[PDB]
Chain A
Amino acid sequence: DLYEGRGPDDIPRMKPLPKLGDVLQRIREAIQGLEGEVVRKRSRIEGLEKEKAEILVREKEVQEILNQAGQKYQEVVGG
């Protein structure tokens, strides 16, 4: 302990104290950034859900078109 105390390399160079208001502002800024990231992820999830709904509507339309084509082919074959 005494060797590290008296050591010119081991006696550390000092620096001043922090700012509590700046620390609180940094914490609040990190919280707001996390909230913005959550909002962006929620908007992306909503857009992906809308795209999935549009894809389901397109798949239903394609299935209806295929059923109509098959019914027309069956009617033509019967005629």
Chain B
Amino acid sequence: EWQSLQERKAYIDLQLQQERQELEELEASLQGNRSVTTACETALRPPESGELDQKKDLEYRLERIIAGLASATTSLIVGTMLPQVRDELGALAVAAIHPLFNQFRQLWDPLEEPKPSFVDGMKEIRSLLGLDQKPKKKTYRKPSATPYETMMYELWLRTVAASVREWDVREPEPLIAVLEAWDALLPGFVRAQLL
């Protein structure tokens, strides 16, 4: 009976140790996810912008969002960041930037302003966007592009084509300046179509 009680106690102790390890791991993961959610809420609730122009205010908001995303990416360790969390953050950044880019690209003249206000932030966060990463090419199926990449392709390439159609051929310096400024975040498909 004492041996049976000792075996039961040893099994209970092993189960308690395994449950304690699982609880510690789950609590650490939950604390990290709560910190990430708090950082996301802090980024989503930023201060207002005093710019009177709508284009200037949207550019300032996009610059603040890109600076916050770059600061979050620098603070988060690359080795300590899960791939699912990285993909979620990239998709969230793409969704946050796409409506702002749609609202700004209507009132932005690529001939007048070759380099936008948030071009530096876009060049800094291109690694998070995935342009710097190598493409994933399948054996049979064509890979659908990234969300931010496809949104940039559609909106920016349509705007650049409109600017190319509107501008005079004899003075290609402003178009070349726009291409040089935006060529860091420009995907290969958009660059080929613009060329």
- Taking beta carbons and an 8 Å cutoff, which residues of A are in contact with B? 1-2, 4-6, 9-20, 23-24, 26-28, 30-31, 34-35, 37-38, 41-42, 44-45, 48-49, 51-52, 55-56, 58-59, 62-63, 66
Contacts and interface: CB of A to CB of B under 8 A. Distances in A.
Interface of B: 1-2, 5-6, 8-9, 12-13, 15-16, 19-20, 22-23, 26-27, 29-30, 33-34, 36-37, 40-41, 44, 88, 91-92, 94-96, 98-99, 142-145, 147, 150-151, 153-154, 188-193, 195
Given A9-B142, A41-B22, A17 B12 contact: no
17 contacts: A1-B191, A5-B189, A12-B145, A15-B147, A16-B147, A17-B98, A17-B151, A24-B37, A24-B44, A27-B33, A27-B88, A28-B37, A35-B27, A41-B20, A48-B13, A55-B8, A56-B9
Contacts, number: 138
A69 to B, nearest CB: 12
Contacts of A56: 5, 9
> Which 7 A-B pairs rank lowest in CB-CB distance, beginning with the nearest?
A5-B192, A41-B23, A48-B16, A38-B26, A31-B33, A12-B145, A45-B19
B6 A59 contact: yes
Contact of A44 (B5, B15, B88, B98): B15
Contacts of A15: 144, 147, 150
A37 B22 contact: yes
B97 to A, nearest CB: 9
B188 A59 contact: no
B59 to A, nearest CB: 19
> Mostly helix, strand, loop or mixed at chain A's interface?
helix
A58 B3 CA distance: 11
B37 A48 contact: no
Contacts of B12: 48-49, 51-52, 55
